[PDB]
Ligand binder design. Structure first.
Ligand SMILES: Nc1ncnc2c1ncn2[C@@H]1O[C@H](COP(=O)(O)OP(=O)(O)OP(=O)(O)O)[C@@H](O)[C@H]1O
Ligand SMILES: Nc1ncnc2c1ncn2[C@@H]1O[C@H](COP(=O)(O)OP(=O)(O)OP(=O)(O)O)[C@@H](O)[C@H]1O
Ligand SMILES: [Mg+2]
Ligand SMILES: [Mg+2]
Lengths: 157, 157
């Protein structure tokens, strides 16, 4: 099959969950998946706990991440370090799916060059499906995507 | 850029020429191109004469090719041999463009499995543009293509 680019955006809950439900499906089907999480949570990683042991590679942003205006140099460096792994996955012919969780924020805060993103996506192995998640996804990424689902919060607990 | 699939079909003259005019443009621009010609001509290869010395790989069907109903086994084997090279080009991340000249006939006469074609096209490096030429291109290849130009013979000398 031809790999496509899927985007889960919107303010409603379920973006990251949709992405990992997709990765789970793929894993359940014997496909190879790699994941990059651009935002580190203070909590234990259930998804990772589940998937990782199946051989799924996970790449998480370093704990140092500040978001502080004063620390942009250091933060951007960490962002770039993690992205290096992503670029690698986006170039691996053997990876059926790549999940780029909370990548929208990286672009929205300029910690990752858009151009670099469009390039790596455009140049990925043909059968490779990429899932991108995050609120406020950049319009140029949305245009490149094959499917864009916007999670509209009709209600939230 | 994202590689696309271009198809030059129709009964009008200019299919092979359009494809090689495209390859020339690409070469003139420093891009890497590879070519497979599914039909061997009795004449000296001008395109090849021109391009080949620029490093362009050319793969031509063996001279043995018969089209004879009695020889399908041997013919299909030769077809498959040449296609092996094509599949390789369609998997090379460093090839910006791949030309599959007269490939339509290979599928139309069942010397090459359609499925194999759709697969290799679908799985090619993302920035890879493929040009397919030939009269009566299979509908399933036409559907996969991004641009399909049909050469309508309004007149022919
Ligand atoms: N509208 C909302 N208000 C408050 N918290 C939310 C809202 N939407 C999602 N969350 C939660 O905030 C955290 C960050 O989630 P994010 O903004 O990335 O949403 P999400 O990816 O759609 O959430 P989830 O991981 O549950 O699918 C999550 O724990 C998430 O469950
Ligand atoms: N309608 C036609 N009648 C006769 N000869 C034709 C016609 N169209 C093309 N030709 C010639 O027949 C040979 C096979 O060409 P083919 O059917 O593959 O056309 P083509 O690829 O469009 O031609 P060209 O290589 O000139 O671009 C060529 O030498 C070609 O120039
Ligand atoms: Mg999320
Ligand atoms: Mg021709």
């Amino acid at each position: 099959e031809r790999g496509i680019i899927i985007v889960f955006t919107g303010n409603g809950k379920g973006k990251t969950t949709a992405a990992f439900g997709t990765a789970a499906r793929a894993v359940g089907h014997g496909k190879n998946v790699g994941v990059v999480q651009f935002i580190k949570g203070t909590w234990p990683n259930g998804e990772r706990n589940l998937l990782e042991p199946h051989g799924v590679e996970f790449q998480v942003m370093a704990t140092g991440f500040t978001w502080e205006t004063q620390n942009r140099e250091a933060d951007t460096a960490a962002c770039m370090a993690v992205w290096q792994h992503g670029k690698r996955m986006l170039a691996d012919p053997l990876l059926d799916m790549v999940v780029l969780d909370e990548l929208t924020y990286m672009v929205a805060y300029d910690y990752l060059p858009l151009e670099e993103v469009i390039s790596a996506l455009n140049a990925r192995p043909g059968h490779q499906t990429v899932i991108i998640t995050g609120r406020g996804c950049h319009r140029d990424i949305l245009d490149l995507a094959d499917t864009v689902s916007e999670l509209r919060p009709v209600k939230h607990a």
